[model samples]
Target: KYVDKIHIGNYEIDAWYFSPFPEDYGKQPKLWLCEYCLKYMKYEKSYRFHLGQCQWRQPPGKEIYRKSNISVHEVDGKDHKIYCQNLCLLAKLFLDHKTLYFDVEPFVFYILTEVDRQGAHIVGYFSKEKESPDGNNVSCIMILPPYQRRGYGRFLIAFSYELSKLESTVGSPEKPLSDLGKLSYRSYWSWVLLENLRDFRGTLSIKDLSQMTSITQNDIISTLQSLNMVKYWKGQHVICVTPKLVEEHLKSAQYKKPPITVDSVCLKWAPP
Candidate 1:
């Protein structure tokens, strides 16, 4: 069945997709979620009571980055298992993939929020493995429907790369990206590559770009290929950069400037 709607904080949000929110609660047409704690309830009275008692003003985690009114909280899945599970359930409402809701002990969740007098209203979040053998930076990412189209998705994507850079490693998202994920990542990759190449002075190989951006070589090659900047020559992939190509890319109307960007200087995180 489907959770038709969810009342989170003061917003009564209609569900955009299905989520496995337990068998009993799944039968309900409406669900209520505490914005601060992300705890869900089936009854309005219980929800209201919980809202009155729910003490959390923000996520139960360390405030890793705070600039202006935007903040990022890093929560350990092992330490905050229920919260992480709730978060996965929430994310699953928007993400179609088989997101890990129960087995969350080996991951870390980075929650993005907009703070004000009311509280730190969660905008979006992305998860990463604590020790990824495959060098995956982002496991699953989602921007709440209410917060979509405000550049939060790109911010999360960029933030993942920032974390990778801090870790002194190259990384990419987990394989089999959703359609929306593919679009957002491709756009971000193109923008990052073009922006760097536009000001670059000397010849740089794909490896050089990977090292510079902390993006995997495979990701770089794919991005370059998508931008028509890669050519196969002499049994090697060659990157072709031209003034005209850059000019056209810059002139394209599809280029979207992120309203919010991850400020690396404000990031206070170390590889754990």
Candidate 2:
């Protein structure tokens, strides 16, 4: 019954703050849809007031992981269309995309949550295609502004690669990433590359980096090229992760402030 506000494009409407599941929508735009029932409102004024009156609410999807402060949910679109559609709608409010919707059946949502004594809280989520010809694992990712600087974005990125490794496929995120998304990927690619290369004692190839990091060869090259860690010598490409570059990057704010790293042993999943 509460109103949600968003700042997508030129729209400043707050009603969007609420998940837009068709079940949560009233017949008319003026009315408000509640989790349990739809209610009428003469105008936005009454609509805003009614939200505080709605008492009961339900979690959007089935839980997959539950612990002290962290939880993860794997929601299937075919079974939970309402929640899945609404999630994309809610995310689209803050993200710029060609489409605001996705076909949920072909994708699985990995929702990250924060748990407390009361229950689990929605932190953010990323979606993965069940299968892709190009081996794209992560289709879309988001971490609400409130949770951005906390490093959830990087965690999700690493989680995506973890799944890629499980599938035994070199994978990358879907193309045309948002500015913020690009920044996260750039930092992650650099960090992972440096970590793996630090222990190497010989020349490295894009193929070698891909095998070590589960990142696609093209993405590995792109990352190295950005940091001037790649050079062409005698018609062959060489990866040169210089000591100076590695030191500066590892000491940079992005690496210094990383919140989480993948520990495969803790993952409950394997290739199926």
Candidate 3:
């Protein structure tokens, strides 16, 4: 896979910025769009070189969650149009074709960053729809290629559910997950579900699971079914997490256990 490299100050983004069929896709008409300023470029080298000097990467407004190394900023789509749109533009580079490119007004952006002597470096972020028809909390999420494989994806997912806890709503992500997206969601759901299941004694229902976790009923079923934890007992559908599966999921290490815990006392946000 060919990737276009762009360096924004201290951060570097290597993304799939080219068409799969380059020769048939017309050569001269090809143009690259900058994430920060939405500037168009005819040459790849020019785009990469220009990003270093582009001054729009600095996110506007205060963040929702900030501590030691990382901070999660909440950007109102209406308040910060350029930053929100630029986020979606950057997100589009790594995301699949199914995701929408524009329309940042209805969505709220949660920009995640790492703090240091230099400044806040972009790690990853997720967007929440301000008005989701189906009560979906997360519209899109990304951990950026350089920041990925380090449990940042799970942290973003957890943050969404944490907001749902504030809103008093059961939530799920917007559908049509890409391959990597599915894996990330599945892993998060599995760990969270298993943690909740550990305290239970008997058969768990989908509704019970949904209540325990902020995950919606359909998503709860999908997670359990994928894990072979859903079973039919006498005609009633039940969520049955086998001891073997639970044991395997806990011990088998693909990604590490979450570094931070989700505590309501720690969250300083309230639903509006």
Over the stretch 1-272, how does candidate 1's per-residue lDDT look in tens digits? 77878888777878777888887887887889999999999999999899778889999899999999999999999999999999998888878775556789999999999999978999889999999899899988888887776688888998999999998899999977878888988988888888788878877788888988888988889889988999999888888979668778976766745358788889999776
Which candidate model has the greater lDDT, 1 or 2?
1
lDDT of each: 0.87, 0.69, 0.71
Q: Which candidate gets the maximum lDDT versus the true structure?
A: 1
TM-score of candidate 2 versus the correct structure, residues matched by position: 0.77
**True lDDT of residue 105, candidate 2:** 78
Q: Which has the greatest TM-score?
A: 1
Once superposed on the true structure, which residue ranges of model 2 sit more than 4 Å away at CA? 1-68, 201-203
Reference-based TM-score of each model: 0.95, 0.77, 0.80
What are the per-model C-alpha RMSD values against the true structure? 1.5, 5.6, 4.6
Best-first order by TM-score? 1, 3, 2
Q: Model 1: runs farther than 4 Å from truth?
A: none
Cα lDDT tens digits, model 2, 20-121, are: 444443333443333221233435556566656755233455554444466677777677776777667667655664266656777788888666554455
Tens-digit lDDT string for candidate 3 (1-272)? 33354444445556664423234222434445554445545566887788677775535666678666677778888898866766665666677734654677887888777777656666777888888888789888876787776777877888899898778789988877767878888888888888778668776678887877888877777788887888878976687667777877777675465555544565578788
